[PDB]
Amino acid sequence: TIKNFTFFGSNNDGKLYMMLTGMDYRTIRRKDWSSPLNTALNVQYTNTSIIAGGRYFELLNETVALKGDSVNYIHANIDLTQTANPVSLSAETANNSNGVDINNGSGVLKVCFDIVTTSGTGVTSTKPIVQTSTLDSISVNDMTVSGSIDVPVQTLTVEAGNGLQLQLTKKNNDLVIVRFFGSVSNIQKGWNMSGTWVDRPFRPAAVQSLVGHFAGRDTSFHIDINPNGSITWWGANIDKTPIATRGNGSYFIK
Amino acid sequence: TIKNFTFFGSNNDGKLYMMLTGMDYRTIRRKDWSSPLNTALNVQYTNTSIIAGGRYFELLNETVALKGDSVNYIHANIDLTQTANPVSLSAETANNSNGVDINNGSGVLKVCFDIVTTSGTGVTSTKPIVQTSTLDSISVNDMTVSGSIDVPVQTLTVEAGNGLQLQLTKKNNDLVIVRFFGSVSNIQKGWNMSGTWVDRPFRPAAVQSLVGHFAGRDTSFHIDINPNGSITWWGANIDKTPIATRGNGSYFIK
Amino acid sequence: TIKNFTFFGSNNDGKLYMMLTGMDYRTIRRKDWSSPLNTALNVQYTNTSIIAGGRYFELLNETVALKGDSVNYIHANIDLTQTANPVSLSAETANNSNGVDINNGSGVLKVCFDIVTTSGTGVTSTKPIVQTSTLDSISVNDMTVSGSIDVPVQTLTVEAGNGLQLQLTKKNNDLVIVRFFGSVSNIQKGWNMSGTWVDRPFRPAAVQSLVGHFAGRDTSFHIDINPNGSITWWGANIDKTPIATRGNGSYFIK
């Protein structure tokens, strides 16, 4: 059975709860207080709470019939005009989440919350749909991440002059790894390189010395990336013959 | 008009909601379900929900008069002694958020939620106030960040001895980038440098070998930063003539 | 006195609130609106709100008696059968939080929220219990962290061949720092090294050149970690005599 609570103003409560937890109409809050049971081509939610569109309901021994040999996307369907039974579940061949705003308008909200894969006769795997918190600015003491943090990534290629090539990758507008390529020739120690300066978003607050290596040799150089974006050669003097330059150097922008 | 919901106990609910979402009195939750409309020196909020001091209300075709040629700071003002209209909006010359605790004592809460810039005749730009979630310890599976993560940063300058200087920058109490400055003279391979040891908070769990470069030359060195904070020279033997030492090296503390 | 609000469906509201804020039964939300006051071996909570098992209640001039010369773990205990006073406080010799599910079943929930250390006559220090937010997937504009972010860490040792050892540490499944160990001999420039290739999870999307240093010498080398996991020697030619190889180099996988 489906027990409905945030229903019949309920929409003002719905919006209130949505804003508190940071959810839009394309996600859910979900908790299996008890394990869902699979017998034959069925999923029985024994005790599962769901919040969808800010509306709280409970799935208490609620069984969904599954189609065999397929990926079943389990949906919660909220139709507020259906006074007695506003919430129903369905098993579908695709994620058909529709993001319909049931708190400000009319229509039926569909949200996928479970993915259940079957064989010919039973369930072989289940995967919950991600519960998304959409927040603005967070202040926190400690954080632990079990998967991954995704931060902004910018990339820039600089033809620094004299044949030298920098490939810069910046993450979190702060950490930069520089990869050296190309070949150096016709330059002296302390000379500014004759080509393109580093773009503003990659310029460090303080001068950075990045060490590189001459391919196939036991010799070394470094360049200085200056705050103004210019690059200063600080290897030895190089004559007319180009020498291949390689290596990773890293620096903080801030 | 302004529709009031968490109002008139309400203050117990107010505090409950504040604690659920992690807000204090100096922030809001805000959602424009519909776009605000500008007509000459006015902002009309067509359908905007706000939570301020844990109190939920709705701005439904609510117009705020604006002052010309200035930055207008739009405030929600909550006075619970005014039972018929506890919430009013104002446009002010500065952000005058007062953080007044209306759920525990008397007073009027003022919180800024919007910044609207005008010319002499109309609105030229609007900028929402940030919605802050103040949290303690978070456990998360995945995170995506569209702006930046700010982590703690510690800096240290070490006069390592023999003329060598290290400038260390530590972020997130883990990633360290070291910048070499100064000079080296009067040292042999495997000798610990004769100056200051690296402070406790910058010491790695295991020995870190950091490659440096001699400015204006094609030659190299490396130092070992030992778990105990001492620094071992592992370049060649250097006589009485000082050689300028440069380069970035990075290591993990944990 | 203890004022009980989410009490006497109340279990449905509790679960809803637990889901909104991302709490399980082994943590709390807690706010001292007013400072708790210590006198002799007692703590008076002057105005403290708590949420435990999604149940909101207030500690308003509520005194807990302490045991002398020890570490007192302050618990909120919730027994729903006790209609008139479902919440009580205890000071105990250990953290005895039991995670009992009072919203779906019977039993007494105990959650620790404070740690109070005493001398023979008085309180010497207090320390709150962390408030945990357990979240799934976060999308955020900006974050500021005052403590630390813990990200996944993977560790690998590669016996690269020719005597060379790579110790790789990968964090956030993206940033790798390689530490060189061992010695190199019997290798020519441009030759692939004769040992194990880098395991899949440490392979970069693009070729990475990592600069190394020869211990006790002024000479350098670099290696290329190729996308397929192979390692290419790009130092000079090395004969039968092993030379110790050291240094830190970093790269991004993505």
Side-chain angles (χ1 to χ4, degrees):
Chain A
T1 115
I2 307 193
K3 225 203 249 208
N4 305 112
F5 293 96
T6 326
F7 291 99
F8 248 28
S10 283
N11 56 309
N12 321 113
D13 276 354
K15 294 186 265 205
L16 157 68
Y17 299 153
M18 281 178 85
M19 298 163 74
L20 293 175
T21 195
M23 80 187 291
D24 61 19
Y25 290 105
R26 297 195 172 271
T27 193
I28 71 279
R29 297 297 174 257
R30 176 254 187 101
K31 170 64 182 188
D32 297 340
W33 303 106
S34 273
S35 273
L37 302 177
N38 316 300
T39 141
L41 295 172
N42 292 283
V43 195
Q44 181 188 62
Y45 300 93
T46 48
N47 188 359
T48 287
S49 286
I50 293 175
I51 300 161
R55 315 298 192 105
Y56 179 86
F57 54 95
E58 300 177 349
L59 303 173
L60 310 164
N61 296 150
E62 180 69 12
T63 293
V64 189
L66 308 167
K67 119 185 254 213
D69 274 299
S70 61
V71 181
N72 296 254
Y73 295 81
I74 319 296
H75 290 73
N77 310 296
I78 294 95
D79 188 344
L80 297 182
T81 67
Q82 294 307 137
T83 300
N85 306 268
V87 182
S88 64
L89 300 189
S90 55
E92 304 182 20
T93 70
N95 189 334
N96 297 312
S97 292
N98 63 10
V100 167
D101 183 337
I102 73 280
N103 295 312
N104 290 296
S106 57
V108 178
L109 169 68
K110 294 172 72 61
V111 227
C112 187
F113 69 91
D114 236 7
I115 305 169
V116 186
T117 301
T118 53
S119 71
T121 49
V123 169
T124 45
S125 69
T126 63
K127 196 166 131 85
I129 290 285
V130 74
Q131 299 174 53
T132 297
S133 299
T134 296
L135 305 166
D136 190 5
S137 173
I138 290 178
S139 174
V140 70
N141 297 322
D142 294 296
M143 174 181 260
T144 177
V145 179
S146 61
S148 258
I149 304 167
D150 204 87
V151 299
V153 185
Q154 266 197 72
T155 281
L156 175 79
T157 301
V158 179
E159 305 292 324
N162 303 268
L164 176 73
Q165 208 171 297
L166 311 203
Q167 193 242 86
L168 300 86
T169 291
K170 175 188 69 166
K171 308 213 179 183
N172 198 39
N173 200 27
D174 184 39
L175 180 58
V176 180
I177 297 182
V178 173
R179 300 165 66 230
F180 294 122
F181 291 103
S183 299
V184 175
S185 52
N186 304 124
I187 187 119
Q188 292 182 22
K189 55 183 113 87
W191 277 14
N192 286 336
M193 313 205 66
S194 69
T196 308
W197 292 23
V198 174
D199 276 354
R200 243 162 212 112
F202 288 76
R203 292 174 202 184
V207 64
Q208 306 293 324
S209 298
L210 307 173
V211 183
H213 183 254
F214 294 117
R217 289 175 193 226
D218 61 12
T219 47
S220 231
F221 69 95
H222 81 93
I223 56 138
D224 273 10
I225 296 191
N226 305 295
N228 71 351
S230 69
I231 296 151
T232 312
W233 178 259
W234 281 114
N237 297 351
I238 319 275
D239 76 341
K240 256 159 232 214
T241 306
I243 315 160
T245 45
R246 300 284 181 279
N248 287 5
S250 93
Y251 65 90
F252 290 132
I253 278 175
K254 292 136 131 66
Chain B
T1 101
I2 298 169
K3 290 238 180 108
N4 300 117
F5 292 95
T6 328
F7 286 98
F8 261 164
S10 308
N11 62 319
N12 335 112
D13 283 340
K15 296 183 272 188
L16 159 62
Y17 298 154
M18 285 175 83
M19 294 162 77
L20 291 184
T21 195
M23 73 185 299
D24 63 19
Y25 288 106
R26 282 170 188 287
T27 192
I28 73 290
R29 300 291 173 258
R30 175 250 185 109
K31 173 71 183 178
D32 292 344
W33 303 108
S34 239
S35 255
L37 299 177
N38 302 310
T39 151
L41 297 167
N42 296 280
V43 205
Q44 194 191 38
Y45 293 96
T46 41
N47 190 358
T48 287
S49 290
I50 291 164
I51 302 169
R55 311 306 193 106
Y56 176 93
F57 56 94
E58 294 178 357
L59 307 176
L60 308 172
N61 291 149
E62 180 69 14
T63 299
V64 194
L66 301 174
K67 111 167 262 228
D69 268 292
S70 44
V71 179
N72 292 263
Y73 292 82
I74 316 306
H75 292 72
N77 308 293
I78 295 89
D79 183 355
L80 304 170
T81 64
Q82 304 305 112
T83 281
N85 354 258
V87 187
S88 66
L89 303 178
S90 65
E92 299 177 37
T93 57
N95 189 324
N96 294 321
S97 301
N98 63 11
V100 162
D101 186 347
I102 83 278
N103 297 307
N104 282 309
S106 61
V108 178
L109 178 63
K110 294 175 72 60
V111 222
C112 185
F113 69 91
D114 234 9
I115 305 162
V116 189
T117 301
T118 55
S119 59
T121 53
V123 173
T124 49
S125 72
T126 74
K127 184 176 140 88
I129 290 286
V130 71
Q131 302 172 58
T132 296
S133 304
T134 302
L135 298 166
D136 190 356
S137 175
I138 294 168
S139 137
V140 66
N141 294 319
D142 295 283
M143 185 180 253
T144 179
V145 178
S146 71
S148 284
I149 309 178
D150 196 71
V151 300
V153 177
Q154 259 196 90
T155 285
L156 172 71
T157 292
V158 183
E159 300 300 324
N162 306 271
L164 179 77
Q165 219 175 285
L166 316 201
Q167 197 261 290
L168 308 79
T169 295
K170 183 186 54 156
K171 309 220 174 171
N172 197 34
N173 197 25
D174 182 37
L175 178 66
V176 184
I177 294 186
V178 178
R179 302 160 67 231
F180 292 122
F181 292 104
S183 287
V184 177
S185 55
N186 308 120
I187 199 144
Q188 302 187 357
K189 54 177 92 92
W191 283 9
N192 285 352
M193 311 201 74
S194 62
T196 312
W197 286 22
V198 174
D199 278 11
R200 245 157 202 102
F202 287 80
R203 296 172 196 180
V207 55
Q208 305 297 319
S209 298
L210 300 182
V211 186
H213 182 249
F214 295 122
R217 295 181 190 210
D218 57 18
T219 46
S220 65
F221 71 91
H222 89 83
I223 55 142
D224 279 353
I225 301 180
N226 306 297
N228 67 4
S230 69
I231 298 156
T232 307
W233 180 258
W234 286 114
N237 297 350
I238 316 297
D239 62 23
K240 291 182 183 219
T241 305
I243 315 169
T245 47
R246 302 287 184 273
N248 288 0
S250 87
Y251 66 92
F252 290 131
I253 281 170
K254 294 135 150 84
Chain C
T1 114
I2 306 173
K3 294 237 181 129
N4 302 131
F5 297 90
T6 325
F7 287 95
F8 276 149
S10 283
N11 66 314
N12 313 121
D13 279 330
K15 290 181 274 187
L16 159 60
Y17 299 154
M18 284 176 78
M19 290 166 75
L20 289 183
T21 194
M23 70 186 301
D24 63 11
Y25 287 106
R26 295 177 167 280
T27 191
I28 74 284
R29 302 291 171 260
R30 181 257 190 99
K31 178 61 176 178
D32 296 338
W33 302 104
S34 251
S35 271
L37 306 164
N38 308 325
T39 143
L41 295 171
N42 311 261
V43 179
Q44 182 186 51
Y45 296 97
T46 41
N47 184 2
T48 287
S49 282
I50 289 165
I51 302 164
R55 311 300 192 109
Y56 179 87
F57 56 90
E58 297 177 358
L59 308 175
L60 305 173
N61 294 154
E62 180 73 7
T63 292
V64 194
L66 305 168
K67 109 169 259 235
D69 263 300
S70 55
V71 187
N72 288 258
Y73 296 84
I74 315 296
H75 292 69
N77 310 286
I78 295 90
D79 187 348
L80 300 174
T81 64
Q82 300 308 121
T83 298
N85 321 273
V87 180
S88 69
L89 300 182
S90 59
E92 308 183 17
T93 63
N95 190 332
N96 296 315
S97 298
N98 62 10
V100 171
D101 190 342
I102 75 285
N103 295 313
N104 292 299
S106 67
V108 178
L109 169 66
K110 307 170 66 58
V111 220
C112 180
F113 68 92
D114 239 4
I115 302 172
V116 180
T117 308
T118 55
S119 69
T121 53
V123 177
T124 49
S125 72
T126 75
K127 189 170 123 93
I129 288 288
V130 72
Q131 294 169 53
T132 300
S133 304
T134 301
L135 303 162
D136 191 349
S137 162
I138 298 174
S139 144
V140 70
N141 295 310
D142 296 285
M143 182 184 265
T144 170
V145 186
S146 68
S148 289
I149 310 174
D150 196 76
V151 293
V153 177
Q154 260 205 98
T155 261
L156 176 74
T157 293
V158 178
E159 285 291 332
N162 304 265
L164 182 65
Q165 235 177 264
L166 299 207
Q167 209 237 243
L168 305 85
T169 299
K170 183 184 64 152
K171 304 206 175 186
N172 194 39
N173 199 25
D174 179 38
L175 175 65
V176 183
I177 294 182
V178 181
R179 305 160 64 230
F180 296 116
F181 294 100
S183 301
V184 177
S185 57
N186 301 113
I187 196 110
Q188 286 188 13
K189 56 180 101 88
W191 281 10
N192 279 359
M193 310 199 74
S194 72
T196 311
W197 294 16
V198 178
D199 286 357
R200 266 207 174 69
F202 291 75
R203 289 171 204 185
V207 57
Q208 303 296 327
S209 298
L210 302 174
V211 184
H213 184 259
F214 293 115
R217 283 166 195 232
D218 65 20
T219 54
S220 245
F221 68 92
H222 85 88
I223 60 146
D224 271 5
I225 299 179
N226 303 299
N228 67 358
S230 75
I231 297 156
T232 312
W233 181 256
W234 283 110
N237 288 4
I238 319 284
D239 67 349
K240 290 178 167 180
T241 302
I243 311 146
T245 47
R246 299 286 184 277
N248 285 7
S250 84
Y251 67 92
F252 288 133
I253 285 170
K254 294 127 143 79

